[PDB]
Amino acid sequence: NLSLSQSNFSADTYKSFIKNLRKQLTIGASYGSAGIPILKHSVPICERFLLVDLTNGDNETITLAINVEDAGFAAYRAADRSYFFQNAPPIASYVIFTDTNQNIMNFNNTFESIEIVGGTTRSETPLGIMHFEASIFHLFVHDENYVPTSFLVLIQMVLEAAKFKFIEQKVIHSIMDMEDFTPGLAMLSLEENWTQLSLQLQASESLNGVFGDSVSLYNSMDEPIGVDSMYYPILTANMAFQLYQCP
Amino acid sequence: NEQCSPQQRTTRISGRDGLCVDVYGALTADGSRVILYPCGQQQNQQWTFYPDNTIRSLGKCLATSALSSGSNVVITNCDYLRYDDGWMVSSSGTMMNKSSHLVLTANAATSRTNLTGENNVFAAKQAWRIGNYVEPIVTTIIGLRHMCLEATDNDTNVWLESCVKNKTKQYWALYSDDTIRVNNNRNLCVSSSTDSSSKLIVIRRCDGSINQRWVFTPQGTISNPGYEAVMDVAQNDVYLKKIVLSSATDKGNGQQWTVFY
Numbered sequence A: 001n002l003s004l005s006q007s008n009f010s011a012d013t014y015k016s017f018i019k020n021l022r023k024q025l026t027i028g029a030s031y032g033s034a035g036i037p038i039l040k041h042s043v044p045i046c047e048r049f050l051l052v053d054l055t056n057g058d059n060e061t062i063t064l065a066i067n068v069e070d071a072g073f074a075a076y077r078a079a080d081r082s083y084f085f086q087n088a089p090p091i092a093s094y095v096i097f098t099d100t101n102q103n104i105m106n107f108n109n110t111f112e113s114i115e116i117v118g119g120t121t122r123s124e125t126p127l128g129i130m131h132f133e134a135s136i137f138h139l140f141v142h143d144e145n146y147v148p149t150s151f152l153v154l155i156q157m158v159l160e161a162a163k164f165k166f167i168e169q170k171v172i173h174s175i176m177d178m179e180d181f182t183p184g185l186a187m188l189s190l191e192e193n194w195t196q197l198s199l200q201l202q203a204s205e206s207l208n209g210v211f212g213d214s215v216s217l218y219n220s221m222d223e224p225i226g227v228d229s230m231y232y233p234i235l236t237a238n239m240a241f242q243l244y245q246c247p
Numbered sequence B: 001n002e003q004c005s006p007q008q009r010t011t012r013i014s015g016r017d018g019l020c021v022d023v024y025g026a027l028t029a030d031g032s033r034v035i036l037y038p039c040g041q042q043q044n045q046q047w048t049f050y051p052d053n054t055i056r057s058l059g060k061c062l063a064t065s066a067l068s069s070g071s072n073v074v075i076t077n078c079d080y081l082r083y084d085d086g087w088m089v090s091s092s093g094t095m096m097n098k099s100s101h102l103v104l105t106a107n108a109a110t111s112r113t114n115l116t117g118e119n120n121v122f123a124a125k126q127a128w129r130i131g132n133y134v135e136p137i138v139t140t141i142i143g144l145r146h147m148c149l150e151a152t153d154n155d156t157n158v159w160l161e162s163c164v165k166n167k168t169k170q171y172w173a174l175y176s177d178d179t180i181r182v183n184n185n186r187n188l189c190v191s192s193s194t195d196s197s198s199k200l201i202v203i204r205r206c207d208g209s210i211n212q213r214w215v216f217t218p219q220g221t222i223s224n225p226g227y228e229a230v231m232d233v234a235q236n237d238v239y240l241k242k243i244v245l246s247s248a249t250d251k252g253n254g255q256q257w258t259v260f261y
């Protein structure tokens, strides 16, 4: 299992981890004109999950199951316990973490769901090395008070960073500067639009790289940039892989 | 999923010095010329793309006007192109007539320059950004050892330094002509070597050349497509204060870059 430990969490090791996570997610990816790998689709449930190990500051380790189709967390394991999101594929519990005490979390693996259940938003949830660390702990013991914010942290710092080099770089800045951060409009607009950028990029094949709709991406100055084509470096050099959307 | 097959999109097209592709005086007669002009909202800069590979303003079609290079690009009645395969835009922003291989070019930088069909050499003056957002994109550029490209020696050189948020010379303006410009001095462009004896990437006055056309690829390189090479940290050693143009290699991380905007 690909793994990342708080014990060895330098900008380099973080970067290698994200690079390898992308590599593994994109095995058997298709490609369009844009050159951005499109994740696999219609994957047999037995092959649908990539397992990733995260370890906090004191050798407590969780294993997260990532759905290779959408780069989302379906479930995770801590010791001989496991926890499945309500919208995980219904057959997943027969395939992953079969020899554990399995449990169902009563919320979906989406930001909307996790934010409502936890009563707190990404904009007010700090990110950084110590938050990563503590998030792993709270998941390890499954302290229900902290499980939703723990997922906001880890989804963003692992999965969303894998999706977008911009976000990977926000975390690197955070490691180098020894400064936690909250995601601003730039980061959130990427997260919000991953699905829609996926669709537009694929749809653009029949319009010389031009999108059917514009997508607003904010820069670090909170200025909105309309991306209505593939000819924006802030998309094309940023989004590392896409959701399958079009034939 | 019909979202997969959009029937049209209306956008703008910007290019050299961030000027827009403009039907001169909004004239609609066949052969009315296309020029370079400051970008605005006017209909004669609104370009509509369609699945038949036409690009249209004022109800008519963008088109070359000769088989040989050197002649104006014009708009003309779209029925005159019913049996033509049309335009092809490369992933790097080169707009090409499919039959003739001529490419939309701006031979000068000034407002009202006539756009022409030219042989492709991958010059910056042959690079365009199809999109409604025509502004230069302000960014830092992160490379090896998580360092930032900085304009140095009175905006004549460029190399990696530790990223400092406030530091004005670590900001770059990314233009619609695929140039990378000093943010505080937008007449200055990152340039591959004009001296045959050197591979050293430098900063020079923007001139529309191949040397100044750059592509941020999805694989994380900064490619100069006409010279078939990429930006590279010399010897993968940031302390040498040298960025160079090299052929793509998987050997070092010196060819990996990030746009942080």
Ligand SMILES: *[C@@H]1O[C@H](CO)[C@@H](O[C@@H]2O[C@H](CO)[C@@H](O[C@@H]3O[C@H](CO)[C@@H](O)[C@H](O)[C@@H]3O[C@@H]3OC[C@@H](O)[C@H](O)[C@H]3O)[C@H](O)[C@H]2NC(C)=O)[C@H](O[C@@H]2O[C@@H](C)[C@@H](O)[C@@H](O)[C@@H]2O)[C@H]1NC(C)=O
Binding pocket: B033, B072, B112, B113, B114
């Ligand atoms: C950008 O494009 C336009 C359109 O192509 C340029 O304009 C044109 O320039 C021609 C000469 O380049 C004009 O021709 C003159 O036309 C009269 C009758 O129209 C004719 O009696 C003249 O001898 C002359 O014609 C040519 O003579 C030389 C021959 O080789 C050639 O076959 C003849 O056609 C023509 O009217 C004109 N077209 C239009 C619609 O304007 C334009 O050039 C700038 O304006 C023109 C008027 C002239 O001052 C040019 O020298 C000057 O470059 C060109 N550049 C810009 C920036 O607009």
Ligand SMILES: *[C@@H]1O[C@H](CO)[C@@H](O[C@@H]2O[C@H](CO)[C@@H](O)[C@H](O)[C@H]2NC(C)=O)[C@H](O)[C@H]1NC(C)=O
Binding pocket: B062, B063, B064, B065, B066, B067, B080, B081, B084, B086, B087, B097, B098, B099, B100
């Ligand atoms: C692309 O270029 C080709 C060739 O220069 C153009 O095709 C010519 O169109 C003219 C004007 O209708 C015809 O008279 C010629 O017979 C065509 N030549 C050939 C070789 O087919 C075409 O118009 C251009 N298309 C666009 C959109 O610019």
Ligand SMILES: *[C@@H]1O[C@H](CO)[C@@H](O)[C@H](O)[C@H]1NC(C)=O
Binding pocket: A086, A087, A106, A107, A108, A113
């Ligand atoms: C969870 O997501 C599913 C989609 O599979 C949706 O139908 C359901 O209403 C969502 N419920 C919550 C808790 O938001």
